[PDB]
Design a protein around this nucleic acid. Sequence first.
RNA 1: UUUCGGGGGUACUCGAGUGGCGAACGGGUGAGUAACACGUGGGUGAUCUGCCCUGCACUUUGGGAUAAGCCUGGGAAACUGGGUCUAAUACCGAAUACACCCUGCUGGUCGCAUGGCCUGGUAGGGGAAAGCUUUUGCGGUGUGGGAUGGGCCCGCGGCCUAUCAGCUUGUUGGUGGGGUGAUGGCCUACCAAGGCGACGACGGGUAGCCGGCCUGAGAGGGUGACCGGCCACACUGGGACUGAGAUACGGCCCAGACUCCUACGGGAGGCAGCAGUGGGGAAUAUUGCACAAUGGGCGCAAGCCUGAUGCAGCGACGCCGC
Lengths: 113, 85, 94, 200
Amino acid sequence: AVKIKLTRLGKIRNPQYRIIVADARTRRDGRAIEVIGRYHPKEEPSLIQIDSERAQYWLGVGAQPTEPVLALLKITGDWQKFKGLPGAEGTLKVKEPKPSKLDLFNAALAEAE
Amino acid sequence: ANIKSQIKRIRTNERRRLRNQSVKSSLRTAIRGFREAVDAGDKDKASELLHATSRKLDKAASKGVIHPNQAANKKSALALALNKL
Amino acid sequence: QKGPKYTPAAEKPRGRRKTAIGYVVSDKMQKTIVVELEDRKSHPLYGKIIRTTKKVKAHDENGEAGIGDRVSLMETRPLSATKRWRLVEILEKA
Amino acid sequence: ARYTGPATRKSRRLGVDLVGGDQSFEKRPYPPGQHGRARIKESEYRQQLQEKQKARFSYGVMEKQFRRYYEEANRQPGKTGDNLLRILESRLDNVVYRAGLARTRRMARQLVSHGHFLVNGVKVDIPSYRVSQYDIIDVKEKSLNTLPFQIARETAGERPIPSWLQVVGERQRILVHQLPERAQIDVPLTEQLIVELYSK
RNA sequence: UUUCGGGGGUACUCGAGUGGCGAACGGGUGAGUAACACGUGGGUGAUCUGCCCUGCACUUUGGGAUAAGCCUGGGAAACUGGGUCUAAUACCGAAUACACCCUGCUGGUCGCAUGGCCUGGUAGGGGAAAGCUUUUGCGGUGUGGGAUGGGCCCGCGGCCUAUCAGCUUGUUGGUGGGGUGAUGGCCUACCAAGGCGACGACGGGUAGCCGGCCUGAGAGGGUGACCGGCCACACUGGGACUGAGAUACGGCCCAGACUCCUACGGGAGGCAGCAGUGGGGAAUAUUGCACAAUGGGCGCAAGCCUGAUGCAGCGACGCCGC
């Protein structure tokens, strides 16, 4: 059975994962058929990217997500779109962008004068 | 020898081997009888011997004792041997 | 409402088997001829173009190919040990 | 590690003043030790090495760090000399010193290492920290009233603040417009000699 | 329910047992191997694929046992014999299937020759299944198509040695058989006398291969530690069995060496898994913590297992920073 797993990357303290499609018999860090997203739980909103069409294709041929990957697929709405139960709603909480350094630079300059 | 599942599998593999051996011996006997009948040169006894042997062959293929391709090869060979005679 | 009871397979284009042109150097075998294939690569270090020769064994049913004829071959599944080519036709006799 | 021994020794040996306003170097501008008066043999290697020692004892950078800096500067698509000079100038302690907030580079390094500063809203105590464009370096509120910053904030008439830096706040904020170019660096010595030495 | 010795029921639950799935992955090592082992690119009209996804059709009918239990025997032990008794999704007979397999005739079509395709048509023969559970309910069989994982064949590429010039007799080709998932001297009977080699066969030595790593201006040279892929092996040497899949590390059989038990009749074992011990050496670590995260196996699930893994301990061993 081909499965949609999470392989581990990053250094010791900070695990950063890749959402890979691979056979269930291969090791965690083995060769991957495809890479269809990444997942970084160390961030405050825990960035999640999933390539929707490839995920749809791999679910269509019958890949089985693991529990963390199933949770992620529900969050991004891909799982619901594949099934069709509540609709395809994006529940993804994207990280709030940080203002530019130039904005703060001019703000400080204006605050000086 | 050290793990419970291994000992259980020893027993179960032995029993499976006994069953498979019986089925294969029966198939070999049927083939041998049919070959002897064809060697004799008479058609009718060869005919329903071929029928019974083909039935035994694909019935053993269903049991999983032999691969379906093997049953197909054996049936084709026997039928061609009869047809040639 | 019901799905079809038969699902035709998705068609797959056929592959391209390797072909070669060579000279017959031996026909002492039944249905078998030995062909001489020449390759011209470049030296990996010194850059000069080097001509190398290689022998393959082809299969011709009727044995219409004599020694010295430019014949054409096409690859095939192993017909015996060492036999992997099939004679297509004789380009020019000699 | 760090170099803690006498500072005047290096100035005397290298033939130039590195602190900037030291009287001992003027009193005796010759190398230290018993044989500080002997004539020297001339060698290109000696001149290149002394230039490198000048560079890395002005900024207080050890040899391994200096070699890393040279590799980084050579790798960059500019030219090696000014790339190395700009990398050296972009250090946090050097920025603090050139900002008029420290009398000497050593005390700037000491202040930075003690975490008296704060870059971009987050405490930084790393003298080797490199400063990028539009960087705001601030003194944390607790240490604003300390005597070092006091005498730094009431003697703002010393060495001019270079163009690429600008103190904007009465609390002595520092703004970095862009990384300095070779024209505005205003440093002793010759970068070409260092480049020649490190290609040997 | 009780005499406090306990006795019955339950099925919440569960030792042992039958049954299923897993155990072929994961983890280790680099001995062998100069080879289609590896890298790269193809071919398979010459092929298999459990679990997973998705169409279609089914899930009919009958039977005989046996583990466990109980009684009893042998043996030092390992272990084992007999009698009686019981269940199944264990095992077995038949019906149906005509989607499938085989055979004969026959049509069209595409070729890259054997041939392939149109589930072509047509005549004959034939091939299965299993129930459980009231709760998000799980299952069984055949067959079409996907997906994954393979197998086999081939071009090219990467060591040193003629103070190693001849080598080969299933060896080279054919035919008929056999065998295999599959082609093929893979095996076999007969027939023919071929096949390879100075473009280095046949011998000898050394060696796991690669992405990469180090060096160098580059070309090149050296290398294959960590991490990642493939191969090979699991005390030594052979062999098959079960299975969708086996070099079967913690399976089986035999032979051997070694270590241990023995009532001398006979038995047991395999750290190149994680720690650890002895030895060799210039030299290389803890008989640690946790399934909290990721991956895996079984289970409807809760859950269970996981020295994989995530961490910690030790060593300036290295890089980086102070």
